[PDB]
């Protein structure tokens, strides 16, 4: 039995930690909603 609990507001934070790269990938999406890489 699943339940929900509030975790916060949805707001943009000025000066949030900036990270992560921006990869461009060829992908396939199957009928089960799973993404896979196309090579």
């Amino acid at each position: 039995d699943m339940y929900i609990e509030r975790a916060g507001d949805i707001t943009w934070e000025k000066d949030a930690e900036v990270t992560g790269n921006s990869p461009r990938l060829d992908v396939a999406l199957d009928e089960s909603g799973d993404f896979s890489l196309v090579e």
Binding site: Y3, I4, I10, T19, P23, L25, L29, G33
Partner: protein
Amino acid sequence: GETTDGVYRVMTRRLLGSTQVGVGVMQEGVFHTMWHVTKGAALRSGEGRLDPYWGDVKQDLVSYCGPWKLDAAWDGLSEVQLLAVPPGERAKNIQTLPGIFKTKDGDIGAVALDYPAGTSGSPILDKCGRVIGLYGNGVVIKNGSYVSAITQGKRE
């Protein structure tokens, strides 16, 4: 139950202790999460019940109490924020420039950030605070790193 707009953890007591299986967004009286978090099951909010209203396994999305309400889209140029809600940890904003998933049916924004599986359903926002999609359905690339699609539904 609690109907206030915002980000919520999705919890279960079926396993050991209380476990966080995912996250979702409450907006305009509708609860939005990824299908793989709830598998379409009903949810509890205090003494109230949230029943599924729409869902699709292929999009990996589900809405409760009403139709999908989120329709903002990534502009394809600007940095965005993942409002990550990790299990047992405080909500935290992470800024990033999305990458792209190129598919036979078009291109999708993607965020290269690695969080526990229980963070699935955390919202990705634009600079106006609008939810442009949910984090948690993606792929594991050549270097073992995780990259999530920016998954967004359609507002009918």
